[PDB]
Ligand binder design. Sequence first.
Ligand SMILES: [Mg+2]
Lengths: 52, 40, 73, 395, 26, 362
Amino acid sequence: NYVYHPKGARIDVSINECYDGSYAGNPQDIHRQPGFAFSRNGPVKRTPITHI
Amino acid sequence: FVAQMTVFDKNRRLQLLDGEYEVAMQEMQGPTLQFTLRWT
Amino acid sequence: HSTVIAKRKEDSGKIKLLLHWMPEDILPDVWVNESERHQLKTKVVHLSKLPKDTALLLDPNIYRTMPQKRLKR
Amino acid sequence: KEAAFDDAVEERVINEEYKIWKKNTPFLYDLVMTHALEWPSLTAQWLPDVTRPEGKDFSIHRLVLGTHTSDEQNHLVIASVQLPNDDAQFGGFGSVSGKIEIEIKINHEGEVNRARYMPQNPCIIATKTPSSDVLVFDYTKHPSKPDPSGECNPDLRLRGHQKEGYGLSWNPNLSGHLLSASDDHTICLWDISAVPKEGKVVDAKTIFTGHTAVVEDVSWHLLHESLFGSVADDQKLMIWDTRSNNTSKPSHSVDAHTAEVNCLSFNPYSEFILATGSADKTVALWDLRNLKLKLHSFESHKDEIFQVQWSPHNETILASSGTDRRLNVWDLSKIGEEQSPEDAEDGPPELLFIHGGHTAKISDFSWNPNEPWVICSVSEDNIMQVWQMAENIYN
Amino acid sequence: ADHELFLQAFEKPTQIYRFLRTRNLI
Amino acid sequence: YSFKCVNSLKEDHNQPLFGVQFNWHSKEGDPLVFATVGSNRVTLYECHSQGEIRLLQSYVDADADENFYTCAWTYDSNTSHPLLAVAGSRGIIRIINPITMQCIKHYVGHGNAINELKFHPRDPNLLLSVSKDHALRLWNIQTDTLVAIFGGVEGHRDEVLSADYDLLGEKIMSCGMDHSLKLWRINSKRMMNAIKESYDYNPNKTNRPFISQKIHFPDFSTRDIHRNYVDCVRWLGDLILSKSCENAIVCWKPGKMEDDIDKIKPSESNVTILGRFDYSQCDIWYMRFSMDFWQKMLALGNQVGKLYVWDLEVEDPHKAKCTTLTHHKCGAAIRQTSFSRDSSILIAVCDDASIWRWDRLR
Ligand SMILES: [Mg+2]
């Protein structure tokens, strides 16, 4: 937040509340039994999507 | 008993002129060796 | 932090002295004249200037190649 | 071990970085288009034809994509895209239903290693396969609905190679003239300009062998119909002017980079300017007049380089792709321009732009006609991105 | 008020950007 | 028949513990190892002589808040490494390899907290998981597939609590808050066909999801035994043991004394009680008893810190036994008891993140 203390600048910071940071990949890998997740060593098929 | 020097620079620039030089070395003040150099 | 390595005397009135630096980083050793001595016992440099190739030596997590074992071409 | 732990870490880091780049994009591009395919691709080619329906705000273009699935049926595909062709228009920008759609599927035996349409006939394209031969097809002769059986008309395959490869180049001036390059350390040349008795069997007219390493790429001249070079892991570029009749000793041969050469491209607007690309993480260039001069070096990629492509519509604009999950854009005009220390810590001047979209080894990219400044990119993560940089950067 | 809460919370986001600082710098 | 406090310990987080499990897969002679799980930590110790116990290892989960509930020791047929799996309120099941000090497998398919884990006495890849979801699941921990789901139109209606394999491993009992105790079978043809199938499936092979087995019917049940919760049952050869908050442990058999166990008709509507056991101050639920691998003695924790011990011998349950080994330090409560493969030592957990040890003097 911008406070503008008279001395030139002041910013009172606070933590984000949500910040939706979660894996953005094949949404399935999240649950592969460990050791196989993030294999990144063989093509895999998934549903098609498109964003703008 | 080990010692090392390199001859050139990345610009193919020699780093070694001729003259009598005093150098030390390490094993695996204290031990040292002197020598000269000449470009013939 | 630099340390004198080799003490070479030029045939002329010069004695170049070899320097190496404690972090053992990308940097190469350097030949120094006794006149410039006591002036570069330690050096500090900004990061954007360092030798690119051997900059990675600080950390594997600097940059990798995720396949790390390429199967196809 | 260690590498596993380390890779987990690196993955999480890359995820964070992509999060940031996404959050930051809006102030950076004039277009952002992302779309996920079921199976990834290894090809990229913009069809040289464009249609623009009226009463709307968007153009229409067709793209040439390959397929390397895991195990199941392979296919050759060409799909549709609705690029906004407007400056005042902006559900999203146009219709609400869809901006991308598949339209062409053809059964394919093995994955696709390469695919380019013939300059004289876009209905003619080539194909590099896991096998030791070449396939050609004309989509207009097959239904989009694929043969549920499987393999179908190879449409005049070729012959003359013994291991697979990746080189592919029609001769622009001369029809039928097409070059190849495979692990055979050889360059095979068919001429399908006239094969009445197809039989799906044509052997290469001429087979050149001057490299003693696995060849990597080959490209025709852009003005001459009798000129082309060669690229292998020999780190030796050899100039092959045909009609001299020696498949052993070319016209010229020098060492290009200290590492194996991968990609190669000529400037369209010039006559002599060559663009070279190697594993050296370097980018060099040459001229047909004299060759014993590495003209310049771009030194910011942090891994191998696999593709270089000049810009249509722009004489002095080039593009460098590789494995570093990055993509560069250079500038031949700003060679050694005094910049502020903050401009310098940003980077050297001649480097113009760096793409920050993909999160894997960038498989392939392409300029397009019909549009000034846009390039599509394909990674190994089933990912297709199309964008347009912001305008302000230039001018 | 075990101020370690204020500490532990704002502890987390810091090191991340910290690493990121160096990384991006190179 | 005399144990003595030769050691007692205490944690630091002070949050109550629940689990105690010797590794009953000790190649003869190997040291005594046992573990215990608390709020969100696990603990590895080793029994030493002279009442010495040595801390070995400990892990913790931070990324959420959970109160771990149970554990179980097994091994790997492939390389014979010891194997321990645990689960808590979040309802997830983890599988840890101490040899590498890592978790290699995690399972998430329930809807509530889990309450107990046991294995088939013979097969080491069959894990039974009892939950509050009224559904008792059963996994092939090796091919990563579910097998059965017991519960449905005729299942338990409220928060299954405890289960127990038969001695041979083809029959199960279940008990939960609804005063209800139901019998399941495993020996059925269908069941074992299913199991064998489970041991054979490649996901890459088919486009099909593996097909589990749903079972909607107990083989037999009743609620006539207790008029309160039931939270721990034990197979007794072919007899039954169960406890309630009514401060008495009971032994019975279904049907009549003449009624064989393996002829019982599903519509059986009678049970035979044999005897009762007695104690004092178990006026809360979630408290368990255990028994020696040789099925000769009985241990039981207590609310006020006491103990009560019997013998599984010819001692007539009318006047079988009475043995209370006591100490003056903690009387908070004691959740669970545990013996070694032999009857050497006996551990129990107090409610205050404090351990106890009792060394037998026969
Ligand atoms: Mg994992």
